[PDB]
Amino acid sequence: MNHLPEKMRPYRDLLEKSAKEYVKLNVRKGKTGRYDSKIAGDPYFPKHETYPTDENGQPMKLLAQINFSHIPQLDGYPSSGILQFYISVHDDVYGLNFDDRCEQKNFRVIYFENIVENDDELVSDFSFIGTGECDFPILSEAAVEPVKSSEWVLPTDFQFEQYTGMETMEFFGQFGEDEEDIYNELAENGFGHKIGGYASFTQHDPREYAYKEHTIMLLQIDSDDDIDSMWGDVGIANFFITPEDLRKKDFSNVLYNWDCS
Numbered sequence: 185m186n187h188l189p190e191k192m193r194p195y196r197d198l199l200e201k202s203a204k205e206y207v208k209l210n211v212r213k214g215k216t217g218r219y220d221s222k223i224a225g226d227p228y229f230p231k232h233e234t235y236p237t238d239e240n241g242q243p244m245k246l247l248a249q250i251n252f253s254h255i256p257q258l259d260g261y262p263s264s265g266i267l268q269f270y271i272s273v274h275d276d277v278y279g280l281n282f283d284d285r286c287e288q289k290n291f292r293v294i295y296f297e298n299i300v301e302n303d304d305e306l307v308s309d310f311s312f313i314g315t316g317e318c319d320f321p322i323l324s325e326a327a328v329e330p331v332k333s334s335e336w337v338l339p340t341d342f343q344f345e346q347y348t349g350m351e352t353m354e355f356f357g358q359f360g361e362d363e364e365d366i367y368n369e370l371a372e373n374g375f376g377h378k379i380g381g382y383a384s385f386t387q388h389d390p391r392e393y394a395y396k397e398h399t400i401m402l403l404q405i406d407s408d409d410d411i412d413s414m415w416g417d418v419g420i421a422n423f424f425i426t427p428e429d430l431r432k433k434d435f436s437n438v439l440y441n442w443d444c445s
Contacts, residue, residue, distance in 0.1 A: 189365065189369050191366060192366055195348075201347075202337040203334050204337075204380065204382060205381075206258070206332075206333055206335060206378050206379060207331065207381075209331075209376075210331060210377075211329070211408065211410060212410075212411075214325065214327050215325060216326075221249060221251050222248065222327060222328060224248070224326065227249050227270075227310075230305060235307070236294065238279065239290055240272075242314060243314065244290075246269070247321070249268045250268075250403065252266070256331075260431065261380070265295055265298075265299070265433075266295070267293070267295050267435065269403065270292040271290065271291045272291070273315065273320060274314070277290075285395065285440055285441055286395065286398075288436070295435045319414075321405075321413060322411060322412060322413045323412035323414075324412040326413075328377075335373070336382075338374040338383065339367055340371050340374060340389060341382040341383040342391050343382065371384070375420065377406055378401075378404050383401050385420065386419050386444055390439070391424070397427070401423070402423045403423045407444075415444050417444040419442055420442065421440075423439065423441075424439040425438050
């Protein structure tokens with residue numbers, strides 16, 4: 185039995201019904217191949233394509249790349265292709281769009297469905313990407329080891345309220361003096377790096393009103409001293425997509441968020 189604080193036990197059946205299969209990403213500082221899933225490092229990129237640039241036309245830098253052929257299969261996710269996440273290196277907010285989290289101005293999400301095999305038609309020299317005045321959120325290339333897992337809905341994720349049928353204030357408030365311990369234990373079972381599953385935030389989930397259909401989390405990267413990942417003050421980043429767009433393999437409306445303490 186996965187542990188549950190005492191007052192939460194009557195809700196065990198509900199939490200089990202909410203369980204979502206996901207892929208935990210164990211990370212290992214080090215060099216990765218051109219076609220591999222990785223955090224930072226160099227991306228797979230065809231010479232004939234236009235490399236992503238930020239609002240001032242400066243080349244962006246790869247935050248992470250996922251090769252769908254290299255992770256456990258999740259319902260609804262592509263069976264192959266390489267999905268990439270990029271951000272500007274020149275802005276003090278890791279390229280987060282303060283106005284519209286889905287407007288790829290200083291961040292970009294690119295999906296290559298068909299992978300080029302010919303080594304000479306791919307970019308190998310990425311020295312053209314600059315160095316911003318601020319440190320990149322992840323300072324060290326890291327390899328990825330996917331492990332399929334499962335987890336109940338997290339209280340940090342706006343879907344929690346949908347499952348319990350009430351606002352979290354009202355929901356955890358019913359536990360009296362145990363409210364904080366209960367909320368914190370449940371929220372802390374989250375975090376870490378992953379594909380799919382439920383979302384963790386140090387502040388507030390931005391989806392309730394503004395992006396209510398972005399219920400699928402494509403990727404979450406947490407602060408992690410093992411690979412020199414640090415989002416502001418021990419924060420966390422994540423990307424979301426709507427079920428419709430994932431089906432269409434359309435990544436032009438992906439929600440990029442990050443927050444910290």
